[PDB]
Amino acid sequence: KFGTQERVNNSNKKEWNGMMGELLSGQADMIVAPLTINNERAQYIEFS
Amino acid sequence: PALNIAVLLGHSHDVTERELRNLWGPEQATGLPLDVNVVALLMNRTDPKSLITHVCDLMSGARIHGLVFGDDTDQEAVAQMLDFISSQTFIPILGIHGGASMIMADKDPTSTFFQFGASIQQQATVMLKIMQDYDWHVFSLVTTIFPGYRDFISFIKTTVDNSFVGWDMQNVITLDTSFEDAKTQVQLKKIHSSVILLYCSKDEAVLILSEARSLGLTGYDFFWIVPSLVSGNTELIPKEFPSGLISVSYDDWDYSLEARVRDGLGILTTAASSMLEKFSYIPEAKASCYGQAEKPETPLHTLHQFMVNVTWDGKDLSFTEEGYQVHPRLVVIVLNKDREWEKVGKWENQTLSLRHAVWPRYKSFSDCEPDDNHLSIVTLEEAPFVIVEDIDPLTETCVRNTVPCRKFVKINNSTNEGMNVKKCCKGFCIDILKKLSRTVKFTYDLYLVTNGKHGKKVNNVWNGMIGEVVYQRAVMAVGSLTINEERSEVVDFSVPFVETGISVMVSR
Amino acid sequence: GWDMQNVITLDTSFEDAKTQVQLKKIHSSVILLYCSKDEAVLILSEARS
Amino acid sequence: KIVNIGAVLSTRKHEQMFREAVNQANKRHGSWKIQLNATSVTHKPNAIQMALSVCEDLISSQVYAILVSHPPTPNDHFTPTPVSYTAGFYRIPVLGLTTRMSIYSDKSIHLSFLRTVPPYSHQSSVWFEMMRVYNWNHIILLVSDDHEGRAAQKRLETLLEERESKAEKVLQFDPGTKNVTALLMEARELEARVIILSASEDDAATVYRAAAMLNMTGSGYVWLVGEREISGNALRYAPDGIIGLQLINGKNESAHISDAVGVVAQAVHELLEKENITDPPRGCVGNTNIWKTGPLFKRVLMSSKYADGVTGRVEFNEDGDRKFANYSIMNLQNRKLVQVGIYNGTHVIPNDRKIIWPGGETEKPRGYQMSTRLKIVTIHQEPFVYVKPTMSDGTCKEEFTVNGDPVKKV
Amino acid sequence: SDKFIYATVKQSSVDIYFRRQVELSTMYRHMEKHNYESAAEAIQAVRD
Known part of the structure; x- marks a missing residue:
């Protein structure tokens, strides 16, 4: 998965999966991928 | 093995010790490997010395392995008193009524004290559930230096940050002191028409509401949702409280004291059965409160991990790690025009059910300006103009370019009544209505028509659109309304915004 | 193409419930005020607050 | 009278x-x-x-x-808790002489409690001044899962949000955990080199031993901790160069008694000039009603500023806790405690002593070290990212484009 | 309709985009029940 803001089953907490799920969790710190720039993803992480 | 539980009440309630003992008489094998010898007691008044002496006497004499305390007064300190007693005696204590039912924040880690109540967090959760159900996304926040306000603001900020609903939080107000003197009016003056969440004490709530009314913050379009702490004692209502104050509280009407005690003893019995089926045997109580026994006093096995997963006969009364009900019994009440707390909604198994699908307008005060910009609007589902859909499974609210709209759907053909389900309406006519509301600056509560179909005069009585509008049940009829001679005679029509004649459809 | 949104009349006192919701209806950047100096002081102080 | x-x-x-x-x-x-x-x-x-x-x-x-004060026995497991509850029944004020626990700061628990000594949560503010003076922006937290650690973390985040900055990670552990190596291992891979600890003496000693076993006490790291972490057994295993805090008069009973007596006498005299004053309840048993003027006397204590106190200017904040205290910033040099400066009610003032950071070096270490090994995440996209199974030798066959140039592969 | 079926990669930029528009929401409801896990799988499905 590239990444999508999704609700988790418990406590209805927002989370990211895929690239930004790994990135916001500290597992990765930079992404080289065909990642489209949009409003939703730019709010939490920054794009060159 | 026999398990001893003491039940302590006050003289305010009419329940006697014999009735308390008979409450443990179901006789369908409640505890498979164990039987309970419940002992009852009544106390004149609650205070530290008498309370500790009584609990120590019950522990030493009956060798009780548990205790359920039902308080009559509204003194909050008895909660911490019972918590301290539990910490010093390792006896599982349950809070039922009165001061034992009002919540303290952080329990001792080594104390087995559980309560029949909900934290400020659950109260805030049901506030936001009310707000989302009525689509009051825009709101403000005014608080005081009353303890627990930091936790409340942190929880609401976490919730708004982690919710897909828009939740347009305007501002946060924290009145330290000198409400009517200075440095407080300027903050209160910048809250616009929205929901104002107030968290303070009742005595401070009176002053806050007086200041708000003096500043004109208590209009028809102002809704205040407040916790049980400001509502407090139901029977007393200060004159400063305007009608329409939505509040959430632990139910004291339906959930009676006898049911309270039965539930508490059931939780204790279920925990005992669980520990028996898991561990070896019930640990005997402590030797005594006094004497300063030279021992770590920590039992090898305790019930603390066993009330987390408890299921009674019909209900699930499980507790959290810090000691809150997973499914607490919360009711949403409002101050009606009769100046009395009347229940509206209820919170069962993480689901909020409201009696009123649409929020009725409440006159805050006798001198309040009459509601004129709020109009009752009817509509009928038409394929190109009025499309009606269910609620969004994702956001649990009406999506963009849609408006709330209640449909009176019957349970079944057997009954002669139904409930109002809040669906979402969109389309050409709804878009026109949105533009009309934006321009003319009027508010609406759209609702589907269920009497007729597009209007018809039968037996000199109009149904549908014309019937609803003529009998003063609505202000305007927005929808696929064909302008007709009889309709124009009966009601007044606007300028036609689209040509709608009669035509023929045939197969090619 | 003037944009005259609304006309505001302060008939009652400037500190009661009225003339507070009435003033909050002002969303423009330009306000045409007409009164005497003493009432002007009170209205301007209320607007500043 | x-x-x-x-x-x-x-x-x-x-x-x-x-x-x-x-x-x-x-x-x-x-x-x-x-x-x-x-x-x-x-x-x-x-x-x-x-x-x-x-x-x-x-x-x-x-x-x-x-x-109320602490017992002569070194154990301090919530000693003033009973009385603070009992006098809280009637809203009778309780003065904390030398009780530095932050659980008593929660006013909704202790209905009526005052103290002349700051708790174990205010040190974070002092720590903030450190980041304001030494220009540290990335911070590592090792707060405990008890009420103390949660309160310290909450206050630190509340003070940091004014800077619009947050701790990079907040590592939390249960009290009394023998093994904490996993959390320090997680902290090692991170970028920040500013470590903050808020835990009991035994937990501090355990985490110090674990970090020393992991070579986290060398050059390039900085340790900033509170009073519990540089006192007792925690001092025995404390590596050199750590920075701690020590209250000037935390353990002085006589001065606290004197200033508390003075301030309560002043507040009593101030209150007894008012009207409708109600006498305190007599007898614990037989009187279940709270003191009517109890909250009023608590407020009088709350806004009373004692003029000339032995411990300094006695003032209580909105939490009922001591305000504007003097903390001796503590540095461990050659296994000896030496004062490297003093923090007044608002600001930190260093002295002639030279600060010795861990590792033996003297210059102020940088807040963090820029990690040059970046963790890269990528997905399989055919036109942009080709992925192929490797051969038996650990790589895959090299390939050359139409121009003959080899393809760069990872 | 039920005869013409079109979909895309589940949990990607295009899903967020189609969820965001106000006019296309209806076809987004046709879109959610056929989303593929990866681009290659969708390309193969179109191929056959």
Whole structure:
């Protein structure tokens, strides 16, 4: 998965999966991928 | 093995010790490997010395392995008193009524004290559930230096940050002191028409509401949702409280004291059965409160991990790690025009059910300006103009370019009544209505028509659109309304915004 | 193409419930005020607050 | 006319000089209008004994305020908790002489409690000044899962959000955990080199031992901790170069007793000039009603500023806790404790002593080290990211484009 | 309709985009029940 803001089953907490799920969790710190720039993803992480 | 539980009440309630003992008489094998010898007691008044002496006497004499305390007064300190007693005696204590039912924040880690109540967090959760159900996304926040306000603001900020609903939080107000003197009016003056969440004490709530009314913050379009702490004692209502104050509280009407005690003893019995089926045997109580026994006093096995997963006969009364009900019994009440707390909604198994699908307008005060910009609007589902859909499974609210709209759907053909389900309406006519509301600056509560179909005069009585509008049940009829001679005679029509004649459809 | 949104009349006192919701209806950047100096002081102080 | 004040203290001589301080306060304020009587109770091992004794001796004596200190025994497991509850029944104010626990700061738990000593949560603010002085922006937290660690973390985040900055990670551990190597291992891979600890003595010693075993006490790292982490057993295993905090008069019972007696006498004199004053309840048993003027006297204590105190200017914040305290910033050099500066109520002032950071170097270390090994995440996209199974040798066959140039592969 | 079926990669930029528009929401409801896990799988499905 590239990444999508999704609700988790418990406590209805927002989370990211895929690239930004790994990135916001500290597992990765930079992404080289065909990642489209949009409003939703730019709010939490920054794009060159 | 026999398990001893003491039940302590006050003289305010009419329940006697014999009735308390008979409450443990179901006789369908409640505890498979164990039987309970419940002992009852009544106390004149609650205070530290008498309370500790009584609990120590019950522990030493009956060798009780548990205790359920039902308080009559509204003194909050008895909660911490019972918590301290539990910490010093390792006896599982349950809070039922009165001061034992009002919540303290952080329990001792080594104390087995559980309560029949909900934290400020659950109260805030049901506030936001009310707000989302009525689509009051825009709101403000005014608080005081009353303890627990930091936790409340942190929880609401976490919730708004982690919710897909828009939740347009305007501002946060924290009145330290000198409400009517200075440095407080300027903050209160910048809250616009929205929901104002107030968290303070009742005595401070009176002053806050007086200041708000003096500043004109208590209009028809102002809704205040407040916790049980400001509502407090139901029977007393200060004159400063305007009608329409939505509040959430632990139910004291339906959930009676006898049911309270039965539930508490059931939780204790279920925990005992669980520990028996898991561990070896019930640990005997402590030797005594006094004497300063030279021992770590920590039992090898305790019930603390066993009330987390408890299921009674019909209900699930499980507790959290810090000691809150997973499914607490919360009711949403409002101050009606009769100046009395009347229940509206209820919170069962993480689901909020409201009696009123649409929020009725409440006159805050006798001198309040009459509601004129709020109009009752009817509509009928038409394929190109009025499309009606269910609620969004994702956001649990009406999506963009849609408006709330209640449909009176019957349970079944057997009954002669139904409930109002809040669906979402969109389309050409709804878009026109949105533009009309934006321009003319009027508010609406759209609702589907269920009497007729597009209007018809039968037996000199109009149904549908014309019937609803003529009998003063609505202000305007927005929808696929064909302008007709009889309709124009009966009601007044606007300028036609689209040509709608009669035509023929045939197969090619 | 003037944009005259609304006309505001302060008939009652400037500190009661009225003339507070009435003033909050002002969303423009330009306000045409007409009164005497003493009432002007009170209205301007209320607007500043 | 006579006014009773209860003071549960550790030793006989403590209540003796408490009585002397009460007499001095009566002399300085004047006993012609009100005579300030003094009653005291000695500590007992059992908390139930505390609960019964405060009723039998203190409440029955119609006291106005209660002064509580720690027992002579080094154990301090919530010693003032019983009395603070019992006098909280009638909203009777309790003065915390030397109780530095942050659980008492929660006003919704202890209905009526005051103290002249700051808790274990305010040090974070002092730590903030460090990041303001030494220019540190990335911070590592090692708070515990108890109420102390949660309160410290909450206050630190509340103070940091004013800077619009947040701790990079907040590592949390249960109290009394023998093995904490996993959390420090997680902290090693991170970028920040500013480590903050807020834990008990045993937990601090355990985490220090684990970090020393992981070479986290060398050059390039900085350790900033509180008072528990540089006192007792935690000092035994504490690596050199750590920075701690020490209150000037945290363990001085006499000065706290004197200033508390003075401030409560001043507040009593201020209150007794008002109207409709209600006498305190008499007897623990038979009186279930709270003191009507109890909250009023608590507020009078709350806004009272004692002029000339031995410990300094006595002032209480909105939480009822001591404000504007002087902290001796503590540095561990060659296994010896030396003062490297003092922090007043607002600002930190260094001294002639030279600070020795861990590792033996003297210059101020950088807040973090820029990690040059970036963790890269990528997905399989055919036109952009080809992925192929590797061969048996650990790589895959090299390939050349139409121009003959080899393809760059990872 | 039920005869013409079109979909895309589940949990990607295009899903967020189609969820965001106000007019296309209806076809987004046709879109959610056929989303593929990866681009290659969708390309193969179109191929056959």
